[model samples]
Target: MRYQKVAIGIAQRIVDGKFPLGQKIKSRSTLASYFNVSPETARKAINVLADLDIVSVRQGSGVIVISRDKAIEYLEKFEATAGLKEMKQDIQRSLLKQKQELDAMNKMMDTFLSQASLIRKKFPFEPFELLLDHDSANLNKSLADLNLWHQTGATVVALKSKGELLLSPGPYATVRKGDILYFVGDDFAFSRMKNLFD
Candidate 1:
């Protein structure tokens, strides 16, 4: 990363005619002293320029600036490499944003579940129960025709008939002497319950 940046700086010196061309660059060591970088980073920066044919390292004689024309395009290839690195970081940013949104979506559902449960409480909590005795008035009639909701002020939630239990028993549900009826209603519903069960 630092290599590309330093190389671009060196490339600029060529454009500005600051560094003399041919046998004068001193390559990596120059980059270290001029750019104030570690040896490893200086080597990397120098290699980038060399690989691009921007300069040549001499045989222990020092260095030469070779590509004044190649850099005339204002370090086009160098900028291209930088562009890709920035694009990579852009994608990395996108990846994190999506995960963060997904996490928020999951949290919203959990909150929806609990809050919607509050709406569900607008339904039922406990039920008023009744066991029709042998001489009960509802024994011979279908629960629907008996119209217990308006009369006894209760909703039939279940009917324990003989040895079987029926959930949300329909109007066709007829009571028997020993059946247990599960119903929901106001707090005073129990008073009306024995009145009918009698």
Candidate 2:
């Protein structure tokens, strides 16, 4: 799933003028190393682009990019095969829109973090803490059954079990015996959560 997303990203970049026509892009091994995926997965990513005619794969010469016009036609053909014109527009638009939105959000987050830094300098108390326990009463129960957030306003942000640390375990995640839970909330919520274990 993730590899497919990477392939789409690469294709979009080409459309966005990141790669010139006739330019040979990264090799299979290089792409595998760069994307931290197996060589086979990287090959599949390239293959998808090839199928779309965004890039041409050569045996020894590597992957060469096709013209933008050609790519556009290929994409149109690919979209036409789905039998829905609205879906074709939606697919391309949605992917491009998401990338644009993410870029915008990341800039906003940078500004938000700068303000957060000022707040941290003024207030010097931890907002969350880790509570480790063994033979807990909540053992074997899923997070949904505990209702920690609704009852105490404290939320488990992380859970450590069987030597594995899980961040933001889903509501269905079961609480096993001897698990260490990390909770984040107001002081009142923290106090209420402590009483649950007692």
Candidate 3:
């Protein structure tokens, strides 16, 4: 994978005016000592450069630069290869970034929606209560008969009536004397109904 990097570096040096046109560069003994590798990789590039006809390789010795002109032409081609490698790197990284954005976005929306639902439905977390008295005007009237929520802007939660716990009542849940009425609404949800229930 990186042999291209080394090969590209050598070509870049040529184009940059280092590695002059006509003499042999210094010799190195081993491929590892020739810089190291799967010698197969080093061997392939060592031979690949010679085929460009820019230079000839001497296995136990050094490299001779015969054609600086040929090497410069291939360097132009190598330019796009490195540029595209970075281009594809973004392709891989952005795919993950988009998913990361969506995941956090989903969580943010759910957070906003929960509070929105509670306010719109008037289903508050903390509730208040009132007691139905024996002589109250609305006594013995069913919730539907009194038009409870509409009249007082509050809905009944539970009714502890006749010693029985009445919760999640139906529309006809009757208001009886001595019942403890639990209900929910806005700031004055209980105040508005307190007068009615009294």
Candidate 3 residue-wise lDDT, 1-198, digit = tens? 667655655566566757677766543234434555665665566566788887788766677777778888978785564677798998989999999999999999999988775663544656677877748778888888887788778878788998888887777788888888888787567778887876
Worst 10 residues of 3 by lDDT: 26-35
For residues 1-198, write the lDDT of model 1, one tens digit per residue: 887788788888887777666647745455677888886776677677778787786556655788787656647764564677798998999999999999999999999988875663565657767777659656878887888888777788899987898998898888888888888876456567768778
Question: In candidate 2, what are the lDDT values of residues 22-44, reduced to their tens digit?
Answer: 78875544777766788787778
The TM-score measured for candidate 2 stands at 0.35
lDDT of each: 0.76, 0.75, 0.73
Measured against the true structure, the TM-scores of the candidates, in listed sequence, are 0.36, 0.35, 0.37
Model 3 steric clash pairs: 32-36
Once model 2 is optimally superposed onto the true structure by TM-score, how far is the C-alpha of residue 123 displaced, in angstroms? 7.3
The Cα error of candidate 2 at residue 10, in Å, is 99
Error at 135, model 1, angstroms: 0.6
